Amino acid sequence: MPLVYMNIIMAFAIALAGLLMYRSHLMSSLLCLEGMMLSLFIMSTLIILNTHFTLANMMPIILLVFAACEAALGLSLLVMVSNTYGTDYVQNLNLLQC
């Protein structure tokens, strides 16, 4: 693979790692989710352009659509959590245990 492929894969890994380790704000983790979506878009677009697969040029648009759906879902859940606690801290979501 070229260097650009490794760079995009590294960006995906960094965004995943970012999502895995929570600080305080929920919104930061949502941003990491969007970052993973962007990295996947870039990687798929590069692969499809390189191989000249004409009918596959439309998949990244579908990916963006479902990324938007996912982001809207997350934002709605954040609105509800904030309305409950007045803060979007993940520390407050501790009513249910294992």
Partner: protein, 55 residues
């Protein structure tokens, strides 16, 4: 000494003690997504190297 104590001690009482201790260890989590998402990260990293690096 034997029937009421040691035969009880080795087979059933040891089993009950071990199962209860492991149940306490496994089931007592605070329910904070931070901790077990960090656990998920550790699992993912271990999995690629331990089982993925060897194909």
């Amino acid at each position: 000494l034997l029937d009421l104590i040691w035969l009880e001690t080795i087979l059933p009482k040891t089993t009950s003690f071990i199962q209860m201790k492991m149940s306490i260890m496994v089931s007592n989590q605070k329910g904070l997504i931070k901790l077990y998402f960090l656990s998920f990260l550790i699992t993912i990293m271990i999995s690629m190297t331990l089982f993925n690096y060897h194909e």
